[PDB]
UniProtKB/Swiss-Prot annotation, chain C:
Subunit structure: Heterodimer of AddA and AddB.
Effect of W72A: Reduced recognition of the Chi sequence, reduced generation of the Chi fragment
Phenotype upon changing R69A: No longer recognizes the Chi sequence nor generates the Chi fragment
Effect of F212A: Wild-type Chi fragment generation
Other notes: This enzyme is a functional homolog of the RecBCD enzyme; unlike the RecBCD enzyme it degrades both duplex strands symmetrically. Despite having conserved helicase domains, this subunit does not have helicase activity. The conserved residues of the helicase ATP-binding domain line a 3'-DNA channel in the enzyme and are responsible for Chi site recognition.
Protein residues bound to ATP: S9, G10, K13, T14, K15, T235, R282
Residues covered by the UvrD-like helicase ATP-binding domain: 1-277
Coiled coil, from the record: none
Record field: transmembrane: none
Function: The heterodimer acts both as a highly processive, ATP-dependent DNA helicase and as an ATP-dependent single-stranded exonuclease, acting in both directions. Recognizes the B.subtilis Chi site (5'-AGCGG-3') which transforms the enzyme from a helicase which degrades both DNA strands to one with only 5' to 3' exonuclease activity. This generates a double-stranded DNA with a protruding 3'-terminated single-stranded tail suitable for the initiation of homologous recombination (Chi fragment).
Family: Belongs to the helicase family. AddB/RexB type 1 subfamily.
Name assigned to this protein: ATP-dependent helicase/deoxyribonuclease subunit B
Curated annotation (Swiss-Prot), chain D:
Signal peptide segment: none
Remaining remarks: This enzyme is a functional homolog of the E.coli RecBCD enzyme; unlike the RecBCD enzyme it degrades both duplex strands symmetrically.
Protein name: ATP-dependent helicase/nuclease subunit A
Organism for this UniProt entry: Bacillus subtilis (strain 168)
Gene this protein is translated from: addA
Family: Belongs to the helicase family. AddA subfamily.
Quaternary data: Heterodimer of AddA and AddB.
Chain's role: An essential component of the DNA double-stranded break repair machinery, the heterodimer acts both as a highly processive, ATP-dependent DNA helicase and an ATP-dependent, dual-direction single-stranded exonuclease. Recognizes the B.subtilis Chi site (5'-AGCGG-3') which transforms the enzyme from a helicase which degrades both DNA strands to one with only 5' -> 3' exonuclease activity. This generates a double-stranded DNA with a protruding 3'-terminated single-stranded tail suitable for the initiation of homologous recombination (Chi fragment).
Length: 36, 49, 358, 143
């Protein structure tokens, strides 16, 4: 159908930077914005 | 002033009054308004007692 | 030395400050301390930005502080940190004990003393009294100023202040010397700054603040004295230091704070400098948003005569449809227009309404 | 110790719990004497170091966005030789120290490299040698 091609890729899509979306930005080494 | 103006349901006004002068009667500030349901369910309880 | 950096939103202040601290790190890595003073929620944001450089990728000389962490630091040196700390709930617990015994002395709240929600209301009022440098004695003073003058509402008022004054002065006596209040650090910091020396010859930047509480204020002007250089970043439009803004002008807040600050720096005989940012920095590629920001206030507002792309208003059948509709938009932005999740931000005046669903 | 107590940087207990000897000992060690005599010195040095995500988390291998590793370098001092690092550890040792050294070395091995990394990358100078002091027995080891 008209959209047969787009539907295919969007369902098979992935977030390029995904594997960094769960990682804590700040990480302390020994403020609620960081982790251990 | 339209946001600070008093234009509302009478209940909405009463609320503003209670909040301001709560200390004149016996009312806990931060009081909560129970919906007609839980309110009735409390009536059933006190009744049975 | 005090520097007033001012301009409208999206003029590039914050960037201008970030870059400076960065070059300053570039030039003298081990130089005197650089203190970046921002609101609590802006701390981790600036920490990530500063350290974002090809050259260095981090910082040592510069630190990002909120009024709290700054106080905590200066105190781990000057002293007072080994003093036990009281939680807001701990204060309420104390308060409820006080309301009991001193109950019968209340001129007004005697009936309201019972209710458990009255302890939280007092606790919040005392907090506000410290932040605004008003001691029990002060409240006492005012409480009898409205006493015996006849404007009903004044009398009533003086009575509340009288009652508060009691619980207040009675809390102070129970917390005297052996306990530390959450809002006590700022006053403690302000009076420990003078003998904290590693903040002397230090460059400091304030940014992201619209206002300052008298207590916070007491910290800044004490920094203006002992610090070598201090810059104040304020979002406003050519504010004046001879008049406080009128009620109905957009920059009432920031304009107000500037005026005060500038006057404090004037009486404190400091060398002052000015930087006014005119052009748009954030919106140079986005005409519409650049217009919204510029014409936001004026009632004689000129309508935008160009095409619609960046700015759009949208109506949803309900908060679900709203979030669910925004969810797909964000996906369209990332997948098509090639954005990253980190570039999107969603704000709610009452986040409690959307929080669960989000 | 008493001044701290007065100024309230030390609780009544913390005060009584301190072993003065184990504190004075350090300054009789070589590292101690060196710390004393120096052109420049500073302690409790806060830092934030941007690193590629991988450098810490091997697990995920694709995204190299920088994360911030933040900490505090106990002590840094400068001599006519170079810049040196110093850290004091309350680890329990004696219960010789010859056998503990290897283990302790690997305990703080990763940490110390991040410290010098932070200094070397950010300050654009280099850290030659790093010492760790241990209050139990008053020992020292270099990395």
């Amino acid at each position: 159908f008209a959209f047969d091609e787009k539907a295919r890729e969007q369902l098979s899509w992935t977030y390029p930077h995904q594997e960094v979306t769960q990682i804590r930005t700040k990480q302390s080494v020994s403020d609620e914005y960081s982790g251990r | 002033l339209l946001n600070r103006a008093s234009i509302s349901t009478l209940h909405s006004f009463c609320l503003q009054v209670l909040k301001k002068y709560y200390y004149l009667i016996d009312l806990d500030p931060g009081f909560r308004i129970a919906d007609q349901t839980e309110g009735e369910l409390i009536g059933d309880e006190v009744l049975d007692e | 030395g005090a520097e007033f950096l001012v301009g409208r939103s999206g003029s590039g202040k914050t960037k201008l400050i970030i870059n400076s601290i960065q070059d300053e790190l570039r030039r003298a890595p081990f130089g005197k301390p650089i203190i970046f003073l921002v609101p609590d929620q802006m701390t981790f944001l600036m920490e990530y930005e500063l350290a974002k450089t090809p050259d260095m990728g981090g910082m040592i000389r510069a630190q990002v502080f909120s009024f709290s962490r700054l106080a905590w630091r200066v105190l781990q040196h000057t002293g007072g940190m080994s003093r036990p700390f009281l939680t807001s709930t701990g204060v309420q617990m104390l308060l409820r004990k006080l309301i009991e015994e001193h109950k019968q002395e209340f001129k007004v709240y005697q009936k309201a003393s019972d209710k458990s929600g009255f302890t939280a209301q007092v606790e919040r009022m005392l907090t506000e009294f410290k932040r605004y440098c008003l001691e029990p004695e002060d409240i006492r003073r005012m409480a009898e100023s409205g006493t015996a003058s006849e404007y009903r509402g004044e009398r009533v008022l003086s009575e509340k202040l009288h009652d508060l004054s009691i619980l207040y002065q009675q809390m102070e006596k129970s917390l005297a010397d052996q306990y530390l209040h959450s809002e006590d650090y700022l006053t403690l910091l302000a009076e420990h700054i003078p003998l904290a020396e590693d903040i002397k010859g230090a460059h400091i930047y304030v940014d992201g603040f619209y206002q300052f509480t008298p207590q916070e204020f007491r910290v800044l002007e004490q920094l203006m004295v002992h610090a070598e250089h201090i810059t104040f970043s304020l979002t406003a439009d050519k504010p004046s230091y001879e008049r406080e803004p009128h009620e109905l002008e957009l920059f009432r807040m920031t304009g107000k704070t500037y005026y005060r600050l500038h006057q404090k720096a004037k009486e404190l005989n400091l060398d002052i400098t000015y930087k006014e940012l005119s052009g748009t920095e954030r919106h140079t590629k986005t005409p519409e948003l650049a217009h919204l920001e510029a014409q936001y206030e004026a009632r004689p507002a000129i309508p935008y005569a160009e095409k619609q792309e960046a700015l759009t208003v949208m109506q949803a059948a309900n908060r679900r449809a709203e979030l669910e509709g925004i969810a797909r938009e964000i996906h369209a932005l990332v997948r098509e227009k090639g954005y990253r999740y980190k570039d999107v931000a969603i704000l709610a005046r009452q986040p409690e309404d959307y929080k669960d669903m989000v | 110790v008493h001044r701290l107590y007065e100024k309230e940087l030390l609780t009544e207990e913390q005060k009584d719990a301190i072993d003065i000897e184990e504190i004075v000992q350090f300054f009789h060690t070589e590292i101690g004497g060196q710390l004393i005599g120096a052109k420049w010195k500073d302690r409790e040095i806060p830092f934030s170091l941007a690193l590629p995500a991988k450098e810490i988390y091997p697990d995920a291998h694709e995204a190299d966005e920088p994360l911030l590793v933040q900490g505090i370098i106990d002590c840094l001092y400068e001599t006519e030789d170079g810049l040196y690092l110093l850290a004091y550890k309350s680890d329990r040792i004696e219960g010789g120290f010859e056998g503990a050294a290897p283990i302790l070395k690997k305990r703080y091995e990763t940490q110390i490299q991040l410290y010098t990394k932070a200094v070397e990358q950010i300050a654009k100078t280099k850290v030659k040698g790093c010492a760790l002091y241990f209050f139990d027995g008053g020992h020292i080891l270099t990395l």
